[PDB]
Amino acid sequence: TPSLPX
Amino acid sequence: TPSLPX
Amino acid sequence: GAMGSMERASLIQKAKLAEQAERYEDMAAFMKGAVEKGEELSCEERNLLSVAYKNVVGGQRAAWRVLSSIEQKSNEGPEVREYREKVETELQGVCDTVLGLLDSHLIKEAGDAESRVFYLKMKGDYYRYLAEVATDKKRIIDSARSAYQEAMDISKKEMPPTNPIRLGLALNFSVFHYEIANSPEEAISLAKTTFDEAMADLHTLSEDSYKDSTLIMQLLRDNLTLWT
Amino acid sequence: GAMGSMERASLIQKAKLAEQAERYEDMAAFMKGAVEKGEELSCEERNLLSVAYKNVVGGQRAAWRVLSSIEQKSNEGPEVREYREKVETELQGVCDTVLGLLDSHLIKEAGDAESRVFYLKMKGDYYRYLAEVATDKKRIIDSARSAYQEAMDISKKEMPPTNPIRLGLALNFSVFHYEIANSPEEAISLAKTTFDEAMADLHTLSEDSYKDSTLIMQLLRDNLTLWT
Ligand SMILES: *N1CCC[C@H]1C(c1ccccc1)c1ccccc1
Ligand SMILES: *N1CCC[C@H]1C(c1ccccc1)c1ccccc1
Ligand SMILES: [Cl-]
Ligand SMILES: [Cl-]
Ligand SMILES: [Mg+2]
Ligand SMILES: [Mg+2]
Ligand code: NA
Ligand code: NA
Ligand code: NA
Ligand code: NA
Ligand code: NA
Ligand code: NA
Ligand code: NA
Ligand code: NA
């Protein structure tokens, strides 16, 4: 799952 | 100017 | 270390140049040098630290995933395993480096909720990356959980539900639940409650803060859509 | 070096894994180790060597261009210049490494036209990258020109005008003329004659060779469109 970028 | 990639 | 002779301000300036040049290994080394000057980091400096190491480990994790997938397909010579182990060890080394900076001594000097939550969220993230490759695994997972949980407790006490740091913490803790802890229902509940409580607080925000919060809220919703 | 204990075949295998993982610094170190085993490189191995170092220096050159542009804008403290110099020195080091591999001893052992032209084209490329940052500059430029020229002489004698290596050599020598030697008319003439002579020889090719040659021909045409 995508996490918080930056 | 673009050169030969790879 | 090797940055010990460079001024703090010059390290920060060069970290910003390194980001513009997409030289994230340099950026991380500069920010490591800046942290090791012993002073607390400003908000902007915390973001530089996070951007730098996030990009370094991001490349390592993506490489590790590629090599592990090949290694797994191969099981259905030693080179694939060896090279996967090489990347994994370098990845663990960067995680150990970041966790060492947080423990020496960013976290203990962070008294303001925003900086303390920021660093504890980072601690959870980097234990989570260690957990992704671990096969002490249970202890690593609980270290990530404990760091995220302390950050959650502070953020819910001290920061509005639309605060980007609090939203980003909740997003990543929910990913931890889904991807690491085998708790998809906890991940979904956390992301839903986080989204709904931020929605109800948007009316208090300026146009610029509205944009910052809703951007992260959309990522929460994206994951909920993937999960349901 | 540090790859001295690893089998040649394992180095090649790991170079291919590194490419799949987009770990080009690793890929280059593996291929350096493979070259330093002392055996000649196959066609596929030459391509791996080229892909690896091309991607490493490509990132360095793009970083250098970003920092030099900032440095120039700043001229209309020392950190910008210092960091530009840091990147420039690491870039020159990789160029020196590749040129050292070609001189020790890839070129002198390359007797077949295709391998010899391949390495001489690489020699011209990496002197060209050194020339991009040079301010010995004339000697560096003439080293690039001499390497390209020897490769041109062999390719025109020994290889069909549609051969991808010959086409790629001509494309990059024409870029050298336009960007380094301040000879835009020579660049245009070379690219036009190269394109026209390959066009007339396409009828001899299989479908697969046709695709390889026309891909490079389109890049020649792209540059001619940019230049005219
Ligand atoms: N990535 C870029 C800015 C910092 C970092 C996250 C983040 C770090 C630590 C705790 C919470 C979030 C971030 C912050 C604000 C907006 C987007 C991303
Ligand atoms: N980049 C990928 C394959 C090798 C390299 C060039 C090239 C190298 C040396 C001499 C001439 C060309 C290349 C070769 C064939 C097709 C595309 C690019
Ligand atoms: Cl390895
Ligand atoms: Cl520097
Ligand atoms: Mg259910
Ligand atoms: Mg004219
Ligand atoms: Na100082
Ligand atoms: Na093998
Ligand atoms: Na391991
Ligand atoms: Na508050
Ligand atoms: Na051997
Ligand atoms: Na300065
Ligand atoms: Na220099
Ligand atoms: Na021939």
Nearest-CA distance from A1 to chain C in Å?
A: 7
Q: Which two tokens stand for residue C192?
A: 């839903």
Of D47, D168, D223, the CB nearest to B1: D223
CA C20 to chain centroid, in Å, comes to 21
- The CB of C187 under 6 Å from ligand 1? The reply is no
Q: What is the DSSP letter of D104?
A: I
Q: Are C114 and C43 in contact (CB under 8 A)?
A: yes
Q: Are C220 and C170 in contact (CB under 8 A)?
A: yes
The count of CB pairs under 8 A between chains A and C is 24
Nearest to C120 by CA among C96, C97, C152: C152
Say whether residue D55 is in contact with chain C using an 8 A CB cutoff: no
Task: Specify the number of domains making up chain C.
Answer: 1
Q: Which ligand is nearest to the CA of C8?
A: 7
How close is the Cα of C14 to the center of ligand 4, in Å? 7
Q: Which two tokens stand for residue A1?
A: 């799952």
Q: Cα–Cα distances in Å, from D60 out to C58, C176, D11, D110?
A: 19, 35, 24, 29
Amino acid at the residue C159:
M
Q: Which two tokens stand for residue C176?
A: 């931890």
Pairwise CB contact (< 8 Å): B1 & D227: yes
Pairwise CB contact (< 8 Å): D83 & C17: yes
Q: How far apart are alpha carbons C59 and D21 in whole angstroms?
A: 9
Technique used:
X-ray
Q: What are phi and psi of C67, to 5 degrees?
A: -70, -40
Q: How far apart are alpha carbons C121 and C150 in whole angstroms?
A: 9
Q: Where do the H-state alpha helices sit in C102-136?
A: 107-109, 113-133
Q: What is the DSSP letter of C7?
A: -
Nearest to C83 by CA among D186, D87, D26: D26
Chain D residue with minimum CA distance to C9: D79
Ramachandran area for residue C44 (φ above 0: left; ψ -120 to 50: alpha; else beta)? alpha
Q: Are D52 and D15 in contact (CB under 8 A)?
A: yes
CA C78 to chain centroid, in Å, comes to 32
Look up tokens 């025109």; give the residue.
D156
Chain D residue with minimum CA distance to C68: D21
Specify the resolution in Å.
Answer: 1.7
How close is the Cα of C165 to the center of ligand 1, in Å? 6
Contacts 24+ apart (CB under 8 A), D72-79: D77/C10, D77/C13, D79/C10, D79/C13, D79/C14, D79/C17
Q: How far apart are alpha carbons D209 and C161 in whole angstroms?
A: 61
Q: Are D1 and D32 in contact (CB under 8 A)?
A: yes
Nearest-CA distance from B2 to chain D in Å?
A: 7
Query: D183: domain range?
Result: 1-228
- Nearest protein CA to atom 5 of ligand 2, as residue: B6
Nearest to C28 by CA among C54, C8, C7: C54
Neighbouring CB atoms inside 10 A of D14's CB total: 26
Kindly report the CATH number assigned to the domain that includes residue C3: 1.20.190.20
**Cβ contacts of C77 on chain D, cutoff 8 Å:** 10, 13
